[PDB]
Amino acid sequence: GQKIKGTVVLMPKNVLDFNAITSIVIDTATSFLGRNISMQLISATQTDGSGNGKVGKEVYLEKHLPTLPTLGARQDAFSIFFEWDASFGIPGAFYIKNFMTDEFFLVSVKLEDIPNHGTIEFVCNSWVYNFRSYKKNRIFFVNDTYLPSATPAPLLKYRKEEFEVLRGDGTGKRKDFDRIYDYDVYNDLGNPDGGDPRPILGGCSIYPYPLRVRTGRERTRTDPNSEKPGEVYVPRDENFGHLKSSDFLTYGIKSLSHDVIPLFKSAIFQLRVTSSEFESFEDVRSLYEGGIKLPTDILSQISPLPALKEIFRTDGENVLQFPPPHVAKVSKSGVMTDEEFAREVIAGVNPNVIRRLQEFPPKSTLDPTLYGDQTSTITKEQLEINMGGVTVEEALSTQRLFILDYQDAFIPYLTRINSLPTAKAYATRTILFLKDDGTLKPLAIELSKPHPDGDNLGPESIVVLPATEGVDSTIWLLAKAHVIVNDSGYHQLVSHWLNTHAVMEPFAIATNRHLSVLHPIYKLLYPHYRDTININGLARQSLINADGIIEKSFLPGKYSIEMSSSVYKNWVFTHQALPADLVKRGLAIEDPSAPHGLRLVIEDYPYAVDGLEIWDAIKTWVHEYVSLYYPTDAAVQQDTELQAWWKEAVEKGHGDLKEKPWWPKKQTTEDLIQSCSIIVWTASALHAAVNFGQYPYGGLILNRPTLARRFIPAEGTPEYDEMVKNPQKAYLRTITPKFETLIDLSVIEILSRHASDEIYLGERETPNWTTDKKALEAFKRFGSKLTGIEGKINARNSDPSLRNRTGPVQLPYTLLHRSSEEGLTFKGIPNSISI
Ligand SMILES: [Fe+3]
């Protein structure tokens, strides 16, 4: 008829296929032709007799359009032609069927020459397999934004039925082409059939945990409540592909545990070619300095590896080396100064654990019936000798006395951790003081362990005080070392894995099952969900599993992920909001005359100043976006899909805490904006701040040690005398050994790197994600408000008064700053939790 011209853009498999990228009249676009991809339009305006929008005639792709519109690197363009029975109406969706054996990546479709109407865009960005591998036809929709009620009457069957496709039926073993999003428990970490069973985390009150994407594999012979090892399913469009093999960071990790870590083991324990121990701090450094000399046979196996090439330089071919962790401009600090040990609690890798003291001595909230007294044995008199004239009550009232308190987190797991074969750790407490130049000063480090029975005086506590001169400075350095083993343990499992990765995948599954492609709050939030179900999947398979990388490298060992469950009991959604986090830890006082409505107790607390400007910027954007679509609390009350999404996020996603009073409703405009802000703050900035500084500070194992293998040496004993004689063997003897150190440095380096692409906070995958010029305009104000913040990061970093912003390591805290480039940067806030 008056025939609608259509334009399809797609990408073959292989431009995004790692394997085909690495390689494991002429015309190729000519084959996606004839009877190979067909398409049918669906009407937003006209209906059949049951009330559902019309479907109009299956028409195959016409020609390979050779020219660039603009396209996008490896994109191939094509035209389809649809006729016009006038009475069809304007198309608001289409159905696509591929008849080819192999999938492709559909990226867009545009519709031209609709008489009376302008060009209709579709933002597709989805893998389309051969029809026969799909339940029913794929439906792609127009980029217009609609609440449930506002959906065109013709498009409602279509909108509400495609959901049912995303939810599936809660049964069956999922296949890779499938897009079914659903929930299961973490019962896939252990291998019981092989002797290494782990407790089922989730679905219990003894073992609470966020639920995760259901995979549906067969059961274990030993425990048919646990699922077998196999390859992890993620719903197909959650596995994001790439042009460039260096950007498949998951392949880099898969190859770490598989190819490399076993060669390093062959090297240390086959013939001992390189020793299992370090003898000095120069040895640990001569890995990013000269490098570790491995034989040519081990190097020549790592040197070809198509996905580990950015992570180390294998070449030199007798040596494996690198990278210099950013704790080097000064090599003598990180690893050593007292003012940097304290500076990293507020601007380091783990910046949101630190409380303020309000009573002295410090307490325990543990349970006196189960753990004994547990109160800190540190006295007024230990603190005060370094408080420079200040009495503890003076500092308590002037909000100068602070703490890093790992007592209650560790003491429950320390009988079990200390009876593991190569471990002998403490549950630590570190008092910090705020000096007049605005710097933190460690005053004392207490070290506890239950000793045997474990509900009596067990705690067995010692207090170690600051020292510059003698043996006492070596016992301080070993006390600070035990403190940072707790801290590294906690950061990995709690600050990073649980409070960002594990806790998000519930909302990510909820959004896909209950908010249509068409939904206002799907468009807002979906960027923040990119590649989270995918690194979580690999993590459940290769990092978080039995005798994997986090258990081998961190103190709790087999009890690691179980530790994040005990700590999960205490996770509060509403406390994940940075002002609420800050206010609850004593580091912010709620103030109306003040800045972000809070007065900071430690004013040069670099993270909280990242934080608050990226927090208000996120919140101003969500407040303005929500305000475009929900005019009234009644609109937030009336959204049939938002209620459903949120009812499920809580009750099935975070099911083991569904009953908590702190869980918000979705009855007002302010409740939507803040739930969405916390989710947007978690996925973008929280993760940035606790992920990208990992190889920067933890790249030196002397700075951030992960394992603790001996207690403080006993006086008048052979191992104490070796602490007087060779202090750096007494240290290295305490912390992570050579094999564990090369497993550690090697994953936290991959995890600290940004891909070429990545998409940072004020960015979006495509410009036309919505047809709302106002949503797009308030998104460019958001982008512009974030470049301003970069600008004030760079000047506070250039401001010499703000000491904590650089410190002895002379590292400008830039983990705050949205913009960054590939890799190794100590900068950059992604949209998502993408590694
Ligand atoms: Fe991460």
UniProtKB/Swiss-Prot annotation:
Q: State a single Gene Ontology molecular function.
A: linoleate 9S-lipoxygenase activity
Record GO biological process:
fatty acid biosynthetic process; lipid oxidation; oxylipin biosynthetic process
Q: Which family does it belong to?
A: Belongs to the lipoxygenase family.
Chief localization? cytoplasm
Q: Does the keyword Methyltransferase apply?
A: no
Where expressed (tissue)?
A: Germinated cotyledons.
| Documented EC number(s) | 1.13.11.58
- Gene symbol? LOX1.4
Q: What is this protein called?
A: Seed linoleate 9S-lipoxygenase
Q: Which reaction does it catalyse?
A: (9Z,12Z)-octadecadienoate + O2 = (9S)-hydroperoxy-(10E,12Z)-octadecadienoate
